[PDB]
Amino acid sequence: YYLYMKYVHPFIFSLCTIIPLNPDETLRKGTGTLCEMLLMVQAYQHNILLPNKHTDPIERFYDGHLLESETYVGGHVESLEAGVFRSDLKNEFKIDPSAIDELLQELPEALKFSVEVENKSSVDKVTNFEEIKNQITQKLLELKENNIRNELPLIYHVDVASMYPNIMTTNRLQPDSIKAERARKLKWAWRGEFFPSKMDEYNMIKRALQNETFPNKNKFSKKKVLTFDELSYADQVIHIKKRLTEYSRKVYHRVKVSEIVEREAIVCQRENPFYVDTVKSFRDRRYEFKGLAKTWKGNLSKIDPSDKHARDEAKKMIVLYDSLQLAHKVILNSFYGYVMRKGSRWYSMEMAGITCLTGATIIQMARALVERVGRPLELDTDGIWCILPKSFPETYFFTLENGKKLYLSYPCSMLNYRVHQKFTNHQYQELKDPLNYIYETHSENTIFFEVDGPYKAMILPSSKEEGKGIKKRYAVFNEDGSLAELKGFELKRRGELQLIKNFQSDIFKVFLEGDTLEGCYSAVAS
């Protein structure tokens, strides 16, 4: 009862205030179906004919081979360095001066960029621009001089706030806008694990499958024995898959051939903008509900600080705004999950394959910039797990004329500056005039990074095979000793072993100790 009320009662009804479904199928069905229903009401609102569901083809052809499955190159997972990296243990750095002297040229324009779009204000109200710029310059000049240093590294995690829908609002990626030579050009990566066999072998054993007998599907009629020609296509291709699997086990020495071919897509920006105003209305509504819930939190909890007053008439609206912003954030993550789901009205492998490769280039540019100024430890879909030195500049505050100290983080603003230089869509055309068809193009980039503070320690495990490590496993915690996030390690595993779960718990307990690397490792050994 309390898990239902405090977690999913206003959440399911907050989702249901915009979704044209009952709450039983809002909770029971898939989240991509919910995104398809909201896309259907947005297509009905701006008069766009909704297409049919994606009736997939029975067979796709490539290089004379049949495609068993067709997808794109997904995410990248890498454990570059494992070990105990802490803020009370020292480590050696190999900082490259090329990124430091190339990064110090662009510094005051980066501070101008920070005060103009991260703070949404002007440069003239900022009075402490020059001294903050000079201490950042002196700190990186001392780090450019003594690039080989050994101190305690502080753990930084970057995160793109709603990465893939921000990618969709920058590049205007729609499933029904990608034209094929019939305009913004971008590059995606195809990936198919097809069969090594050719067309002639498939035709010969298909003729051999034509000379057999097969059972009947419907168990209510009077027909039990059927021939190959009266059969459907799904049973045919499932039988095709299994005999070509034993054919490639007998003729060839593998089952799937991995081949990645980079292709191109044409995105005509003069189309109907209902998809980008749909994802931007849900992102602006999440930010509006976040602002409404923060004003309601601060003002309505400080205006009535007595428990003798009726403050519980406002508790339903505070949990209503928290559930509405939670519903819009899971709708954005489900927009990315719904763009590559089978049987979708707005289906394209192209619209989802552009996003993960443009996000992989964003995270690879971030990984290379991190690689030239520090040590990356883990790379995943949303950010990079890295260690930067303690003498690197972290947080400063810009003072305005009105008295507001604006929040500034240096690697978050330098990564926002680098993504705005390399991934800004200047061809973002939109409807300036509906009657005279005048389109207006401008600059648009809503891809923003956010680093959330210094962490105490980070411990990553690795493999028992030479060449790589164990993917997606780490342990990070807050600076006050409590656990922040645990991904990959279960520590409460029910089914593996009880001993392994309590062993992981007291190994994390002994991990929170020591000022030497040998002492924390000997504590884990004891």
Binding site: Y1, Y4, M5, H9, P10, F13, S14, C16, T17, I18, I19, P20, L21, N22, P23, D24, M37, M40, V41, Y44, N47, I48, L49, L50, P51, N52, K53, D176, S177, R182, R270, E271, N272, K316, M317, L320, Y437
Partner: protein, 235 residues
């Protein structure tokens, strides 16, 4: 056959919900206009919509069937509840190869589906697979009206060999649109009715009470059981 069985099932659903405080609220005969903020001059009731369901309500010349609607379930501000339904006709679209050869397709569906149809209208909608559609080019479609969703499935089954043998008026139908969209989805999208919002149930539609941003007070019972079970097995 399948027509009266769903009406008997909807009468059983009405007899089950008639003891749960969900009675059919009938709006009065209002001759007023269409407005949103005007709530003090319209005969209705402001209710909080909590559940909606695709049912088959009766007529109140047709055969032994009924007009398909959506049963709505509410929560009044006086600690009580009431239910209501709406009159609606389902539809789906049919694509076409030529904008001047649509007369052959309308005469073919007017003769081929004489007992299945209710009415007919031509709707122009935006198709994004069309070249130069942004300059003022739309796709002209055919919107068929029905009285039930069973009639929509019957019209789909009767139109099944034409689109499959196509890929004369028989060789003009290429593919159909909006056929697999559910009925409750169609009534919630076209009448702009979302569940969880406060609505004044009038005879002239479902206007939205956007003053009350808060929800109503429902009654939640979250049960959990314990049972006898065999040794080391599932019960």
């Amino acid at each position: 056959a399948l027509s009266a069985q769903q009406l008997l099932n909807a009468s059983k659903i009405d007899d089950i919900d008639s003891m749960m405080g969900f009675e059919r609220y009938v709006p009065p005969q209002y001759n007023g206009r269409f407005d949103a903020k005007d709530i003090d001059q319209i005969p209705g009731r402001v209710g909080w919509l909590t559940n909606m369901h695709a049912t088959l309500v009766s007529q109140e010349v047709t055969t032994n069937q009924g007009i398909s609607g959506v049963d709505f379930y509410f929560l009044d501000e006086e600690g009580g509840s009431f239910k209501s339904t709406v009159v609606y006709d389902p539809y789906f679209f049919i694509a076409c190869n030529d904008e001047s050869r649509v007369n052959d397709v309308e005469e073919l569906v007017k003769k081929y589906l004489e007992s299945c149809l209710k009415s007919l209208q031509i709707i122009r909608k935006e198709d994004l697979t069309m070249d130069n559609h942004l300059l003022g080019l739309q796709k002209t479609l055919i919107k068929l009206s029905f009285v039930n969703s069973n009639q929509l499935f019957e019209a789909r089954k009767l139109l099944r060999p034409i689109l499959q043998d196509n890929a004369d008026a028989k060789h003009l139908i290429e593919d159909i649109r909006e056929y697999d969209v559910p009925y409750h989805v169609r009534v919630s999208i076209d009448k702009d009715i979302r569940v969880g919002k406060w609505y004044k149930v009038t005879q002239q539609g479902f206007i939205e009470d956007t003053r009350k941003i808060a929800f109503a007070d429902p009654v939640v019972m979250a049960f959990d059981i314990e049972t006898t079970k065999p040794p080391l097995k599932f019960p």
